[PDB]
Design an enzyme around this catalytic site. Sequence first.
Site, PDB file in Angstrom:
ATOM      1  N   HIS A 118      16.216 -96.590  53.165  1.00  0.00           N
ATOM      2  CA  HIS A 118      15.776 -97.297  54.381  1.00  0.00           C
ATOM      3  C   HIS A 118      16.814 -98.388  54.962  1.00  0.00           C
ATOM      4  O   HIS A 118      17.127 -98.538  56.079  1.00  0.00           O
ATOM      5  CB  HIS A 118      14.597 -98.194  54.268  1.00  0.00           C
ATOM      6  CG  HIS A 118      13.347 -97.405  53.812  1.00  0.00           C
ATOM      7  ND1 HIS A 118      12.837 -96.361  54.562  1.00  0.00           N
ATOM      8  CD2 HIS A 118      12.282 -97.528  52.900  1.00  0.00           C
ATOM      9  CE1 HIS A 118      11.876 -95.857  54.082  1.00  0.00           C
ATOM     10  NE2 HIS A 118      11.536 -96.390  53.007  1.00  0.00           N
ATOM     11  N   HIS A 124      11.099 -91.721  55.882  1.00  0.00           N
ATOM     12  CA  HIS A 124      10.546 -90.841  55.042  1.00  0.00           C
ATOM     13  C   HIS A 124      10.674 -89.340  55.106  1.00  0.00           C
ATOM     14  O   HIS A 124      10.754 -89.089  56.221  1.00  0.00           O
ATOM     15  CB  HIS A 124       9.114 -91.317  54.679  1.00  0.00           C
ATOM     16  CG  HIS A 124       8.705 -92.755  54.166  1.00  0.00           C
ATOM     17  ND1 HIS A 124       7.767 -93.626  54.566  1.00  0.00           N
ATOM     18  CD2 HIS A 124       9.656 -93.375  53.286  1.00  0.00           C
ATOM     19  CE1 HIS A 124       7.926 -94.481  53.807  1.00  0.00           C
ATOM     20  NE2 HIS A 124       8.922 -94.646  53.060  1.00  0.00           N
TER      21      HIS A 124
HETATM   22  C1  LIG Z   1       4.568 -95.873  53.012  1.00  0.00           C
HETATM   23  C2  LIG Z   1       4.084 -96.411  51.255  1.00  0.00           C
HETATM   24  C3  LIG Z   1       3.381 -95.193  50.817  1.00  0.00           C
HETATM   25  O1  LIG Z   1       5.206 -96.559  50.546  1.00  0.00           O
HETATM   26  N1  LIG Z   1       5.822 -97.812  50.483  1.00  0.00           N
HETATM   27  C4  LIG Z   1       6.148 -98.424  51.474  1.00  0.00           C
HETATM   28  C5  LIG Z   1       7.458 -98.165  51.604  1.00  0.00           C
HETATM   29  O2  LIG Z   1       7.837 -97.090  52.165  1.00  0.00           O
HETATM   30  N2  LIG Z   1       8.669 -98.874  51.085  1.00  0.00           N
HETATM   31  O3  LIG Z   1       9.784 -98.184  51.134  1.00  0.00           O
HETATM   32  S1  LIG Z   1       5.660 -98.156  48.782  1.00  0.00           S
HETATM   33  O4  LIG Z   1       5.947 -99.735  48.552  1.00  0.00           O
HETATM   34  O5  LIG Z   1       4.324 -97.781  48.265  1.00  0.00           O
HETATM   35  C6  LIG Z   1       6.768 -97.314  48.183  1.00  0.00           C
HETATM   36  C7  LIG Z   1       6.498 -95.832  47.764  1.00  0.00           C
HETATM   37  C8  LIG Z   1       7.345 -95.136  47.027  1.00  0.00           C
HETATM   38  C9  LIG Z   1       8.689 -95.644  46.781  1.00  0.00           C
HETATM   39  C10 LIG Z   1       9.737 -94.897  45.916  1.00  0.00           C
HETATM   40  C11 LIG Z   1       9.929 -93.408  46.455  1.00  0.00           C
HETATM   41  C12 LIG Z   1      10.673 -92.859  45.322  1.00  0.00           C
HETATM   42  C13 LIG Z   1      11.572 -93.257  44.488  1.00  0.00           C
HETATM   43  C14 LIG Z   1      11.060 -94.902  43.952  1.00  0.00           C
HETATM   44  C15 LIG Z   1      10.267 -95.323  44.877  1.00  0.00           C
HETATM   45  C16 LIG Z   1       8.758 -96.918  47.009  1.00  0.00           C
HETATM   46  C17 LIG Z   1       8.097 -97.804  47.731  1.00  0.00           C
HETATM   47 ZN   LIG Z   2       9.871 -96.098  51.841  1.00  0.00          ZN
END
Ligand SMILES: CC(C)ON(CC(=O)NO)S(=O)(=O)c1ccc(-c2ccccc2)cc1
Ligand SMILES: [Zn+2]
Length: 159
Positions: A118, A124
């Site tokens: 990000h 995503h």
């Molecule tokens: C949109 C939502 C479902 O996801 N998140 C917010 C976000 O996108 N922050 O980046 S999260 O914090 O839950 C989240 C979810 C998954 C991961 C992740 C994915 C792959 C590997 C490690 C972590 C990190 C944060």
């Molecule tokens: Zn994310």
Amino acid sequence: MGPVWRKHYITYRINNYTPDMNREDVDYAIRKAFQVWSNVTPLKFSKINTGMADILVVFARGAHGDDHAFDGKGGILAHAFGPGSGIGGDAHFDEDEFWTTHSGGTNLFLTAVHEIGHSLGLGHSSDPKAVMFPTYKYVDINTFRLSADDIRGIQSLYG
Ligand SMILES: CC(C)ON(CC(=O)NO)S(=O)(=O)c1ccc(-c2ccccc2)cc1
Ligand SMILES: [Zn+2]
Ligand SMILES: [Ca+2]
Ligand SMILES: [Ca+2]
Ligand SMILES: [Ca+2]
Ligand SMILES: [Zn+2]
């Protein structure tokens, strides 16, 4: 395209350290997470100990100075802002999670790889094999690989 860094030399600084882990382990997790992206791009990452950095890494809880309060234990793990000045690029980890170097709690290295994606301008993925797919799941660190989708995405932004 969304925003991208307009230079390939990008700096980062760790604002503060989670007490869940040893300091040396946080440094290592973050360094290796940057290395993952460096390995497939012309991007070079450089750590700053004091002063201005492009990507500030922060551990904080609840409402912590931006429009996006964390939500306590569980739920949201972390979030990061796309390339830009100021808060742009910055990566925030929810201190109400339990950060680890392993499969217990929430693995810092894997989460940082996703957040740095990000910070570099990725959104995503819909590929479940991609680190940018928005579901956290532990895979062991020695065998972790970016997917072909992650590589396609990041190379479309840089190089
Ligand atoms: C949109 C939502 C479902 O996801 N998140 C917010 C976000 O996108 N922050 O980046 S999260 O914090 O839950 C989240 C979810 C998954 C991961 C992740 C994915 C792959 C590997 C490690 C972590 C990190 C944060
Ligand atoms: Zn994310
Ligand atoms: Ca949370
Ligand atoms: Ca920044
Ligand atoms: Ca914690
Ligand atoms: Zn935040």
